[PDB]
């Protein structure tokens, strides 16, 4: 199953939440809940002077951290 695949229980709940937000009806509630599933954030770490993306843990849920 998905357990030994390497993903966390929390990514699992978020996948379920994404699906629920899909199937539900169009309205103000959906307008609220699509926000609670959309991915827009990032991560950054500071080089000697510059910014660089810490891409060791992705935001998308299908992938696996390594």
């Amino acid at each position: 199953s998905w357990r030994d695949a390497g993903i966390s229980y929390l990514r699992y709940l978020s996948i379920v939440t994404r699906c629920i937000h899909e199937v539900q009806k169009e309205g103000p509630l959906l307008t609220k809940n699509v926000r609670f599933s959309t991915i827009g954030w990032k991560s950054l770490y500071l080089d000697h002077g510059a910014t660089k993306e810490y891409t060791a843990i992705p935001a998308e849920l299908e992938k696996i951290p390594e």
Binding site: R3, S8, Y9, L10, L13
Partner: protein, 102 residues
Amino acid sequence: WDRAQIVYNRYHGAASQKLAIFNLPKFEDWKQKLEEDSAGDGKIEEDGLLQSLPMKTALGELEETAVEDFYNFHSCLAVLNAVSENELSEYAARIVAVENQL
């Protein structure tokens, strides 16, 4: 890590945005504290604290993977509350620190 001190801003009101922290123990440390406190009699060791002996028994009944998820889940909610309180405090302190600029 052994202890994670989350730090954030607490929106007490539109005019007061103080600090607030969550002192999270480690899972391998928290499970041992769970068993140690679940054995002895349940006496609150600090004023304003809630007794939790029945919980640390019942969690002992719960399986291994599920208690791992218990810790990770409740810690996730702690994190999320910190982020939410700081968003409201950001937008509550900006109006103050902007009207003074005006």
